[PDB]
């Protein structure tokens, strides 16, 4: 219930942007947990030990799980890293990850301090 810190307000803003229609053309693979069984990716959980996605990040922010911006950023980067680990580098989903990570990194760099 307590107010997010100033840095976590900035993080929440970024999160809102990543989930916004503005970026939907490349963000949509990251909206929800990878459903490995549904997608036929029966090796996914053998390869990715720590799944992460934007819905999970949103829930953690709402629940005040993140104690600082660094913790938030680690989860967003984990999400991208998982994509880069599992998928061949020339896959369309990787191109989408790179584009969304560019959005993330450039706005994260504008953190107040
Ligand atoms: C391996 C993998 C799959 C998906 C994924 N989530 C989907 C949801 C609904 C429908 C399809 C979904 N996919 C696979 C798509 C295959 C084509 O490129 C976009 C993702 C997302 N990410 C980040 C991955 O690393």
From Swiss-Prot:
Subcellular localization(s) per the UniProt record: Nucleus; Chromosome
Residues covered by the Bromo domain: 2-111
Outcome following mutation: residue 87 to A: Abolished binding to histone H4 acetylated at 'Lys-12' (H4K12ac)
Outcome of swapping residue 39 to A: Reduced binding to histone H4 acetylated at 'Lys-12' (H4K12ac)
Summary of subunit composition and partner proteins: Homodimer. Interacts with E2F1. Interacts with (acetylated) STAT3; promoting STAT3 recruitment to chromatin. Interacts with CTCF; promoting BRD2 recruitment to chromatin.
Note on domains (UniProt): The first bromo domain specifically recognizes histone H4 acetylated at 'Lys-12' (H4K12ac). It also specifically binds histone H4 acetyl-methylated at 'Lys-5' and 'Lys-12' (H4K5acme and H4K12acme, respectively). The second bromo domain recognizes and binds histone H4 acetylated at 'Lys-5' and 'Lys-12' (H4K5ac and H4K12ac, respectively).
Known function: Chromatin reader protein that specifically recognizes and binds histone H4 acetylated at 'Lys-5' and 'Lys-12' (H4K5ac and H4K12ac, respectively), thereby controlling gene expression and remodeling chromatin structures. Recruits transcription factors and coactivators to target gene sites, and activates RNA polymerase II machinery for transcriptional elongation.
Other remarks in the entry: Some specific inhibitors of BRD2 that prevent binding to acetylated histone are promising therapeutic molecules for the treatment of cancers or inflammatory diseases. ABBV-744, a small molecule, has been tested on tumors with success: ABBV-744 antiproliferative activity is mainly restricted to cell lines of acute myeloid leukaemia and prostate cancer and is able to displace BRD4 from chromatin. GSK046 (iBET-BD2), which specifically inhibits the second bromo domain, is a promising therapeutic small molecule for the treatment of inflammatory and autoimmune diseases.
Family to which this protein belongs: Belongs to the BET family.
Protein name according to UniProt: Bromodomain-containing protein 2
Gene: BRD2
Range within the parent protein: 344 to 455 of 801
């Amino acid at each position: 219930m307590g107010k997010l810190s100033e840095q976590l307000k900035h993080c929440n803003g970024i999160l809102k942007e990543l989930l916004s229609k503005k970026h939907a053309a490349y963000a949509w693979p990251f909206y929800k947990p990878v459903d490995a069984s549904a997608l036929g990716l029966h090796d996914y959980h053998d390869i990715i030990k720590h799944p992460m996605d934007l819905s999970t990040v949103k829930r953690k922010m709402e629940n005040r799980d993140y104690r600082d911006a660094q913790e938030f950023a680690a989860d967003v980067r984990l999400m991208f890293s998982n994509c880069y680990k599992y998928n061949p580098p020339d896959h369309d989903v990787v191109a989408m990850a790179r584009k969304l990570q560019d959005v993330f990194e450039f706005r994260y760099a504008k953190m107040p301090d």
